[PDB]
């Protein structure tokens, strides 16, 4: 019982490590790209704005 417990706890420690690592890389890639998603979408309301100002300038005559 003792040696199969030393084995079981070494394995559960590897297990949880393996998982805590995988779960954090997934939360990180998500969070990082959401911030790049958020950053680019910000820049594109600037692109869409840079035209409503240019198109507005044609609406004169």
Partner 1 sequence: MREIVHIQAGQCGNQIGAKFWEVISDEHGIDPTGSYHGDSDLQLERINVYYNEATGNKYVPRAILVDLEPGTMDSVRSGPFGQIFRPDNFVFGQSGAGNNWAKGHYTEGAELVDSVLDVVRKESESCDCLQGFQLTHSLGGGTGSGMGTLLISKIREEYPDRIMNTFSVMPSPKVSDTVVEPYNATLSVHQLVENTDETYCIDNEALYDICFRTLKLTTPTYGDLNHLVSATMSGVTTCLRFPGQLNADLRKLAVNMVPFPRLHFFMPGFAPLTSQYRALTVPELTQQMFDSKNMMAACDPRHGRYLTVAAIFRGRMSMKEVDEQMLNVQNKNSSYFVEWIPNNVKTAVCDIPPRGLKMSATFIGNSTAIQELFKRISEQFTAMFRRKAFLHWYTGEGMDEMEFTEAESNMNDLVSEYQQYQDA
Total number of residues binding partner 1 (CB under 8 A)?
Answer: 7
List the beta strands (DSSP E) in 1-61.
none
Question: What tokens were used for 3?
Answer: 């040696």
Judged by CB under 8 A, the residue of 6, 25, 36, 38 near partner 1 is 6
Interface with partner 1 in residues 8-47 (CB under 8 A): 9
Q: Select from 2-10, 16-24, 28-36, 49-57 the region that touches partner 1 (CB under 8 A).
A: 2-10
List the beta strands (DSSP E) in 2-56.
none
Query: Would you tell me which residues interact with partner 1 (CB under 8 A)?
Result: 1-6, 9
């Amino acid at each position: 019982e003792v040696i199969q417990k030393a084995i079981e706890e070494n394995n559960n420690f590897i297990k949880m490590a393996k998982e805590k690592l995988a779960q954090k890389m997934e939360s990180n890639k998500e969070n990082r790209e959401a911030h790049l998603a958020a950053m680019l979408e910000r820049l594109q309301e600037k692109d869409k704005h840079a035209e409503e100002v240019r198109k507005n300038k044609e609406l004169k005559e």
